[PDB]
Structures are given as structure tokens and as C-alpha cells.
Amino acid sequence: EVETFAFQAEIAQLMSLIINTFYSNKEIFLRELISNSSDALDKIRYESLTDPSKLDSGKELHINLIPSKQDRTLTIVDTGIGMTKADLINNLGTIAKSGTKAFMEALQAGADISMIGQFGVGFYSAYLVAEKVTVITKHNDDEQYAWESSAGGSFTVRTDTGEPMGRGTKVILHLKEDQTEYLEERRIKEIVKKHSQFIGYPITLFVEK
Numbered sequence: 001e002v003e004t005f006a007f008q009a010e011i012a013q014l015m016s017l018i019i020n021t022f023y024s025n026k027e028i029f030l031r032e033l034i035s036n037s038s039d040a041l042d043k044i045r046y047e048s049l050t051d052p053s054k055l056d057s058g059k060e061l062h063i064n065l066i067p068s069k070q071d072r073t074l075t076i077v078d079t080g081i082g083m084t085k086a087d088l089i090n091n092l093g094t095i096a097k098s099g100t101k102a103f104m105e106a107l108q109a110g111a112d113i114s115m116i117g118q119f120g121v122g123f124y125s126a127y128l129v130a131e132k133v134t135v136i137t138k139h140n141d142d143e144q145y146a147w148e149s150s151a152g153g154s155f156t157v158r159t160d161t162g163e164p165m166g167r168g169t170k171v172i173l174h175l176k177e178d179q180t181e182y183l184e185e186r187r188i189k190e191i192v193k194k195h196s197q198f199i200g201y202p203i204t205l206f207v208e209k
């Protein structure tokens, strides 16, 4: 079964701002997702120091960037700590409430959308370029789940029926029709060089066949 949920009110409001406000500097979404992956890799690496079995689901710690011009998707894959069902439905939204309110306040005071990561809600910058986001994720202590939202106030969670991940997270960006530049190998290279050239895990930009 597929379960459908309403976003926290502040988060639905934030998504509507992101999806609708005119802002040309959309490329910052990739830096934010890569930063999130780095944070998740940091966390499983840290936990493995006192419990090495936490890496039985996979010893490699890396980030992969996978464009698909055919599917019009850009996928960010990490082997980080992954997200639980409770993370997807409640916990990550709850911790984002105060940062979301503060961010939207700062936007009214003159801040820029590119500061979204400094408020801890950089995940939602995905909707600068994506009409729908699918998140496939697997935490050691939980099953593999698929989260999905096209904004509009709601999201779904279901147990994943795809191939097992071991552990980590795949963020699948279903790009807007006019945002296909983020499938170009040279555009992705430019963005990664510019924003996140100091990330401590191997980042591999897959080439299309």
C-alpha cells in the first residue's frame, strides 16, 4: 500500500515559494544535495567507529551523480546512513520547522534563496529544478522505502519494490522541461567544481551511453 501525507504547513509554504518565485540561480540545488550526502556519509562513518557491523550493508562511502536524458532525471546517490520511515514521514520535517520559518523570514528581510542551506532546509531546493522528487532510501535499522512528492501539499511513502540498495539514499530529480541543462556532463562538472570541490568522499559523475 501507498500512504499519503500532508507536509507540515511551513514546509508546504516553503515548497510553494521555491517552486514559484523567480530565481535564476537554480544550480545551487546540486551543492545542497551533495552536502546532505556528505553529512549522511559522515554519520555512518562515525557510527562505524564504535560498531563496525554498521558497514555490513556496504563498506564503500561515495556519492554518484547519474544523469539520464532519456528519463529526464538527475539522480544523486550516496551510501550514507540512509533514512528510516520515521525520518521520511515525520522527523526530518519536524527538525526543519524552525529553519524553514527563519529562512522565509530572512527572505522577507532581503536574504537570497541561495542561503537556503544555511537554514538547514537545502533539500527543498530540489524543487528549483524538479517537478517531482523521488527518494529511495535504506537505513540499517529499517526497510527500503520510496518517498515521492510533486509538491502541492502532499507526499507519499511506500515500501520500495525496486532493487536493493544495501544502505544509503537515491534522490531522483524529475526535471522541469526547461531545466534539462542539469543533465549535461559539462554543466554538472561546472557546478560541482564551483560549489562542492572540497567534499571528503569520492564524487563520480556518470556519463550517459
Ligand SMILES: Nc1nc(Cl)c2ncn(Cc3cnc(-c4ccccc4)o3)c2n1
Residues within 6 Å of the ligand: 036, 037, 040, 078, 080, 081, 082, 083, 087, 088, 092, 093, 123, 135, 147, 169
Ligand atoms: N542524502 C541524505 N541522506 C540522509 Cl540520511 C539525510 N538526512 C537528512 N537529509 C537531508 C534532508 C532533509 N530533509 C530531507 C527529506 C528527504 C526525504 C523526504 C523528506 C525530507 O532530507 C539527508 N540526505
